[PDB]
Write an enzyme that holds these catalytic residues in place. Structure first.
Site: not given
Length: 171
Positions: A71, A80, A82, A140
């Site tokens: 993202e 970044h 995840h 999320y």
């Protein structure tokens, strides 16, 4: 039980992209996705390349389940990643060195100079590593729609198809 963490890819990393990264022949399935162009495309190529390398990497990473999602950084430039990952060979002691070694090994082929990413494990302020990676994916990561999520790769059965499905992520 899966660990989770984040790496950064600063804009200086993207400035060092060589022509093997830019002119990659990788064609990615965007039929249910936003278009992938400029550095967004580069990031998508990198995650796909990291995923392909991980699929054929043993040792502590053998048999691991993984979910990578890249993202944009909202306030600064860059991206970044995840990283949700777990497996029989992975543990709080070797997590950072294995993840960092994997991502930097693949990255090294795509930059002109020496550029190295840092993996920051998700953990409490006393040092207990997070083990809620599955919940983090469901609550999320999978709720983002492109291009809030730029690209995603996984080997987890629940998400092999849905992870790059804008339609799934919306509903």
């Amino acid at each position: 039980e899966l660990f989770r963490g984040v790496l950064q890819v600063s804009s200086n990393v993207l400035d060092c992209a060589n022509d093997n990264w830019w002119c990659s022949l990788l064609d990615l399935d965007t039929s249910d996705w936003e278009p992938l162009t400029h550095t967004n495309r580069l990031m998508a190529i990198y995650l796909s390349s990291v995923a392909s390398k991980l699929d054929f990497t043993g040792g502590p990473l053998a048999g691991c389940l993984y979910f990578f999602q890249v993202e944009c950084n909202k306030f600064e430039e860059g991206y970044h990643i995840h990283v949700v990952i777990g497996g029989p060979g992975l543990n709080p002691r070797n997590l950072t060195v294995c993840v960092e070694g994997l991502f930097n090994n693949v990255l090294y082929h795509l930059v002109t100079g020496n550029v190295k990413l840092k993996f920051l494990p998700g953990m409490t302020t006393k040092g207990k590593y997070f083990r809620d990676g599955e919940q983090f994916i469901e609550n999320y990561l999978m709720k983002k729609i492109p291009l809030n999520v730029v690209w995603c790769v996984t080997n987890i059965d629940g998400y092999i198809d849905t992870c790059i499905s804008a339609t799934f992520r919306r509903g």
